[PDB]
RNA sequence: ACCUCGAUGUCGACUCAUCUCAUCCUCGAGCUGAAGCAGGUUCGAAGGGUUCGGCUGUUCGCCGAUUAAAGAGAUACGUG
RNA sequence: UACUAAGUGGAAAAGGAUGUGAAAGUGCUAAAACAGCAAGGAUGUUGGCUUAGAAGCAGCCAUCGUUUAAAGAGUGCGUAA
C-alpha cells in the first residue's frame, strides 16, 4: 500500500517547510503550496535526505489521509523538480489551434471563434498545427486546463475527430 | 503480416505475394524448386514477419489427421471419440512418428509417438 | 508449499554438486517459441537449463563449492547452464541466442569451477 | 443512462463503486453502465 | 398444471401456516435443496415456471425433485358482485408452505450449475428462499 | 353502508381558474440497432404555454386543418 | 460502555451492493504473498468436416499428447480468411 512507502527528498536546491496549515516545497521552478485542513492526526518528520510519515492513531479517515497526502506530497515534489506535460492530439479535417500571447485559440467547425485563457504558471506549445503540448508545475492545473479545452468536440466512434489524450485509443464503430 | 499456408509447387500469385517485401518471380521459382516432386499435398509453410523477408525458407511435414488412414487402418468414419471402426498398430505409429520427428520442436522419439497419438485422438483412436 | 521447497533445495543442491562447471546468464525480454527451439538445440547436450528462485540458489551455491557470490539470481530473467561435459555446445547455443538479442549480460558462473568474467567466456563460446 | 432496482456486473470489466451514497458501475463499454439500487 | 383429479370435497376452508414447518424439514433425494424461510401460499403455475427454468438450465445430465404438491383449492368470487349468496367458485390450486421446509432439490451436476439453477428458480417463488446442502 | 333524508341540488357546456409530475412542447444529459436530418429510450426538471371546427347533450370518440404541443390527473368525477 | 453519519432515529416489501462493527476456523506469508509493474503466453493445428472466405475466434470433432518454470483447438476483444 501507500503511506508507509518512504518518500525520497531532493536536498540539492529543493527544500521543504511545514506549518500547521502550510506545507511548501521550493525547487528550480517556483514553489508548491499544500494547505492542510486543521486537526490532522497524521504526523510528519523528515530525516536527512529521507521522508517517512504515519498516522498516529487508527481510524478509517486517518488511514485515508495517510495515503492521500503522501500521494499529493510526492506529486508536488515530482512537479517542482520536473514539471508535467500533457499531449493533446488535435485530429480533424479543418480543426487546428495556436496561441496569441495569453490566449490559446482554436479553429473548429464552429461559427463562433473559440479562445481559452491560460492560468498563471502554465505554458503551452504548438510544435505542429495539429497537436498541442501543455506543460505545467502540478498535474492538477494541467489536467484542469486539458479538461477545459476538451469540452468542445469530444471524440466520436464513427470517425476519429477532436482532441485525444495521446494513446487514448478510440474504439471505432460501423461507419455506414 | 500474417501466417502463410500454400501448396507445395508452382504458385505465381499468392494471398499476399506482391506487398510483403519480396518478388513473386524471385519467390515462386525456388518455392517450386524445393517442392518439385512434393506437389499434391497441403504442406505447412511459414513466412517470417521480418521487414526484409530474408531467405530463411523452411517447410514442415505433411499434416496429421489426413494420413491417419495408413497409421490406424480406418476409413474416416464418425469424428467422435466414442465410435471406432479399427485399431492403430505399433509399427505404423512408429513409422509415422519417425517421419514426423522433423516437425517437432524437440529431439525425442517416444515424445514424438505420444504427440502423434494425441493428435490422432481427434478420431478417438489410441494404441491397443 | 514449504516442505516441497526444502525438498527442491535438497534436489537442486544434489544436482549442482554432482557436476563442477556451470554458468548463469541473464537473457531477458525473450520468448517461448525460441525457448523450445533452445530445448531442441540442447537435447544432444548432456547439460540442461532450468529456471529457479533466488533464495534457493543463495542457500545452495555455498554447498556446491562455488565462491564469488553476491547476487546469485537478480536483474532479469534467470536460468542456469550447468554443464557436466560438452557445455561447449550449450555455450555456443547461448552465444548465438544473445547474438539474436541486443547485448550480453553476464551474471555468474564459470566453465569448470571458478567464477570468472564473461570478457573471456564469450571468446570461449565464440 | 440505466435505472434499475438491482445492479450486477455483466462483463469482465464492470467494476462497482459507491459514489454520493449511490451504488454505481463503470466499464470500458458504454452499454454496461448502470446506476441505481 | 399440476392438479389433483378428484376430491371428496369441492370447497374446503383455508389453513394457517404459522409456526415451524411440518415434514420435509430435510433433504431426501437430491444433493442441493432450496428451503423456504417464510410460510405462504404458492400456486402450481409458479412451480411450473421454477421447474421449466430448472430443466432448461440443467440439461439432460442431472436430476431434480419437487417436494410439495397442491392439495387444496380456494375460491374466488367473480368480479363486481355483492356479498353473500354462498361461496364463490374455485379457480386455482395452492400448496401451503410453512417456513423452514424445502421446495426443490437437484443432484448430479457441478456446483456452479446447481447453485445458479436454484437461484434462478428461487426468484419465481413469493417466499424468502435459501440454499441448503445435504445433511451428512 | 361509517356522515347526511327536521333536504348535503345530481352531466356536460360557459367564464374563472389553482395544484401534483408519472412531461405534450420548449430546456440539460447518458446510451443507441445515434453516418447527418429526422428519431427510440432513460434520467433531471412544473416557469410558461398546451388550437380551431363538423357529428352528437355529450366527457370520451371519429374526422379536417394547423401549430411547439394539441399532456396525465385532482380540487363534493373544480365551481347552478 | 459500543454503535451507526443516515437527521436513519422519525412509514413499509421482493431485490441489489468493497456501508460498517463483532464472532468462528478457513488458504498464503518475512524459504516472501496479495496489488501493481518486465517479459514470455508455445507444438501436433491455417489439424480435419462445412462455410466459393471461418484456418487459436460462422458453427463442429476430439477437446488430448509434447516443449517447460510458464501457457488454454486458447480469458476473451478483435480478422471473408
UniProtKB/Swiss-Prot annotation, chain A:
Pfam family, one: Ribosomal_L6
Keyword Nucleus part of the UniProt annotation: no
Alphabetical list of SUPFAM superfamilies matching this protein: Ribosomal protein L6 (SSF56053)
Keyword entries, A-Z: Ribonucleoprotein, Ribosomal protein, RNA-binding, rRNA-binding
GO MF terms, alphabetically ordered: rRNA binding; structural constituent of ribosome
Keyword Amino-acid biosynthesis appears in the UniProt entry: no
GO CC entries: cytosolic large ribosomal subunit
Domain of life: Bacteria
GO biological process annotation, one example: cytoplasmic translation
Function text: This protein binds to the 23S rRNA, and is important in its secondary structure. It is located near the subunit interface in the base of the L7/L12 stalk, and near the tRNA binding site of the peptidyltransferase center.
Protein family membership: Belongs to the universal ribosomal protein uL6 family.
Subunit note: Part of the 50S ribosomal subunit.
Protein's name according to its UniProt entry: Large ribosomal subunit protein uL6
UniProt organism field: Mycoplasma pneumoniae (strain ATCC 29342 / M129 / Subtype 1) (Mycoplasmoides pneumoniae)
Gene name of the record: rplF
UniProtKB/Swiss-Prot annotation, chain C:
Residue runs in coiled coils: none
One GO cellular component term: large ribosomal subunit
GO biological process, one term: translation
Keywords tagged on the record: Ribonucleoprotein, Ribosomal protein, RNA-binding, rRNA-binding
SS bond partners: none
GO MF term (any one): large ribosomal subunit rRNA binding
Family affiliation: Belongs to the universal ribosomal protein uL10 family.
Record note on quaternary structure: Part of the ribosomal stalk of the 50S ribosomal subunit. The N-terminus interacts with L11 and the large rRNA to form the base of the stalk. The C-terminus forms an elongated spine to which L12 dimers bind in a sequential fashion forming a multimeric L10(L12)X complex.
Described function: Forms part of the ribosomal stalk, playing a central role in the interaction of the ribosome with GTP-bound translation factors.
UniProt-recorded name of the protein: Large ribosomal subunit protein uL10
Native source species: Mycoplasma pneumoniae (strain ATCC 29342 / M129 / Subtype 1)
Record lineage: Bacteria, Bacillati, Mycoplasmatota, Mycoplasmoidales, Mycoplasmoidaceae
Curated annotation (Swiss-Prot), chain D:
Keywords: Ribonucleoprotein, Ribosomal protein
InterPro entries (alphabetical): Ribosomal_bL36, Ribosomal_bL36_sp
CC per GO annotation: cytoplasm; ribonucleoprotein complex; ribosome
A GO biological-process term: translation
Origin superkingdom: Bacteria
PROSITE patterns: RIBOSOMAL_L36 (PS00828)
Keyword Heme recorded: no
Segments crossing the lipid bilayer: none
UniProt-recorded Gene Ontology molecular function terms: structural constituent of ribosome
Family that this chain belongs to: Belongs to the bacterial ribosomal protein bL36 family.
PANTHER family in alphabetical order: 50S RIBOSOMAL PROTEIN L36, CHLOROPLASTIC, LARGE RIBOSOMAL SUBUNIT PROTEIN BL36C
Stated name of the protein: Large ribosomal subunit protein bL36
Lineage: Bacteria, Bacillati, Mycoplasmatota, Mycoplasmoidales, Mycoplasmoidaceae
Gene: rpmJ
UniProtKB/Swiss-Prot annotation, chain E:
SUPFAM superfamilies in the cross-refs: Ribosomal protein L16p/L10e
UniProt xrefs under InterPro entries: Ribosomal_uL16, Ribosomal_uL16_bact-type, Ribosomal_uL16_CS, Ribosomal_uL16_dom, Ribosomal_uL16_sf
Domain of life: Bacteria
Pfam family, one: Ribosomal_L16
Signal sequence interval, chain numbering: none
Entry GO terms, CC: cytosolic large ribosomal subunit
One annotated GO biological process: translation
GO MF annotation terms: rRNA binding; structural constituent of ribosome; tRNA binding
Keywords, in A-Z order: Ribonucleoprotein, Ribosomal protein, RNA-binding, rRNA-binding, tRNA-binding
Cited function: Binds 23S rRNA and is also seen to make contacts with the A and possibly P site tRNAs.
Quaternary context: Part of the 50S ribosomal subunit.
Family to which this protein belongs: Belongs to the universal ribosomal protein uL16 family.
Name under which the protein is recorded: Large ribosomal subunit protein uL16
Lineage summary: Bacteria, Bacillati, Mycoplasmatota, Mycoplasmoidales, Mycoplasmoidaceae
Originating gene: rplP
Amino acid at each position: 500500500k501507500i503511506g508507509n512507502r518512504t518518500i525520497t527528498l531532493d536536498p540539492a536546491k529543493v527544500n521543504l517547510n511545514f506549518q500547521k496549515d502550510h506545507i511548501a516545497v521550493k525547487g528550480p521552478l517556483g514553489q508548491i503550496e499544500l494547505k492542510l485542513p486543521p486537526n490532522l492526526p497524521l504526523k510528519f518528520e523528515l530525516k536527512d535526505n529521507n521522508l517517512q510519515i504515519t498516522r498516529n492513531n487508527e481510524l478509517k479517515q486517518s488511514k485515508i489521509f495517510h495515503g492521500t497526502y503522501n500521494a499529493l506530497i510526492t506529486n508536488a515534489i515530482i512537479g517542482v523538480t520536473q514539471g508535467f506535460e500533457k499531449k493533446l492530439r488535435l485530429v480533424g479535417v479543418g480543426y487546428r489551434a495556436n496561441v496569441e500571447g495569453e490566449t490559446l485559440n482554436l479553429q473548429l467547425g464552429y461559427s463562433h471563434p473559440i479562445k481559452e485563457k491560460i492560468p498563471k504558471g502554465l505554458t503551452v506549445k504548438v510544435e505542429k498545427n495539429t497537436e498541442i503540448t501543455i506543460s505545467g508545475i502540478s498535474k492538477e492545473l494541467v489536467g484542469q486546463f486539458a479538461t477545459e479545452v476538451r469540452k468542445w468536440r469530444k471524440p466520436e466512434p464513427y470517425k476519429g475527430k477532436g482532441v485525444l489524450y495521446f494513446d487514448e485509443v478510440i474504439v471505432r464503430k460501423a461507419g455506414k | 503480416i500474417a501466417k502463410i499456408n500454400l501448396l507445395g509447387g508452382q504458385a505465381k500469385p499468392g494471398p499476399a505475394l506482391a506487398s510483403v517485401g519480396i518478388n513473386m518471380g524471385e519467390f515462386t521459382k525456388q518455392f517450386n524448386e524445393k517442392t518439385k516432386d512434393k506437389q499434391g499435398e497441403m504442406i505447412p509453410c511459414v513466412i517470417t514477419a521480418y521487414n526484409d523477408k530474408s531467405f530463411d525458407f523452411i517447410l514442415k511435414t505433411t499434416p496429421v489427421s489426413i494420413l491417419l488412414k495408413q497409421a490406424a487402418k480406418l476409413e474416416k468414419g464418425a469424428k467422435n471419440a466414442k465410435t471406432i471402426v479399427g485399431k492403430i498398430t505399433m509399427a505404423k505409429a512408429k513409422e509415422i512418428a519417425q517421419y514426423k520427428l522433423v516437425d517437432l520442436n524437440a529431439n525425442t522419439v517416444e515424445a514424438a509417438l505420444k504427440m502423434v497419438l494425441g493428435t490422432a485422438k481427434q478420431m478417438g483412436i489410441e494404441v491397443i | 508449499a514449504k516442505k516441497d521447497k526444502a525438498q527442491q533445495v535438497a534436489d537442486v543442491s544434489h544436482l549442482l554438486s554432482t557436476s563442477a562447471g556451470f554458468v548463469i546468464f541473464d537473457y531477458t525480454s525473450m520468448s517461448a517459441i525460441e525457448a523450445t527451439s533452445i530445448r531442441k538445440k540442447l537435447f544432444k547436450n548432456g547439460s540442461k537449463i532450468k529456471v529457479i528462485k533466488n533464495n534457493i540458489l543463495r542457500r545452495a551455491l555455498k554447498a556446491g563449492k562455488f565462491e564469488g557470490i553476491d547476487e546469485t539470481a537478480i536483474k532479469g530473467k534467470l536460468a542456469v547452464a550447468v554443464g557436466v561435459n560438452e557445455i561447449v555446445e550449450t555455450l555456443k547455443a547461448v552465444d548465438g541466442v544473445v547474438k539474436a538479442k541486443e547485448a550480453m549480460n553476464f551474471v555468474c558462473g564459470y566453465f569448470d569451477n571458478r567464477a570468472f568474467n564473461s570478457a573471456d567466456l564469450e571468446k570461449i563460446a565464440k | 443512462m440505466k435505472v434499475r432496482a438491482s445492479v450486477k456486473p455483466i462483463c469482465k470489466d464492470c467494476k462497482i463503486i459507491k459514489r454520493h451514497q449511490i451504488v454505481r458501475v463503470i466499464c470500458k463499454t458504454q452499454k454496461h453502465k448502470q446506476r441505481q439500487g | 398444471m399440476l392438479q389433483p383429479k378428484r376430491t371428496k370435497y369441492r370447497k374446503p376452508h383455508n389453513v394457517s401456516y404459522e409456526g415451524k414447518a411440518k415434514g420435509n424439514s430435510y433433504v431426501a433425494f437430491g444433493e442441493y435443496g432450496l428451503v423456504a424461510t417464510k410460510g405462504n401460499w404458492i400456486d402450481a403455475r409458479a412451480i411450473e415456471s421454477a421447474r421449466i427454468a430448472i430443466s432448461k438450465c440443467l440439461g439432460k445430465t442431472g436430476k431434480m425433485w419437487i417436494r410439495i404438491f397442491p392439495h387444496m383449492s380456494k375460491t374466488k368470487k367473480p368480479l363486481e358482485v355483492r356479498m353473500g349468496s354462498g361461496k364463490g367458485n374455485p379457480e386455482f390450486w395452492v400448496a401451503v408452505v410453512k417456513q423452514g421446509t424445502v421446495m426443490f432439490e437437484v443432484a448430479n451436476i457441478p456446483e456452479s450449475q446447481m447453485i445458479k439453477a436454484l437461484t434462478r428458480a428461487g426468484h419465481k417463488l413469493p417466499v424468502t428462499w435459501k440454499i441448503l446442502k445435504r445433511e451428512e
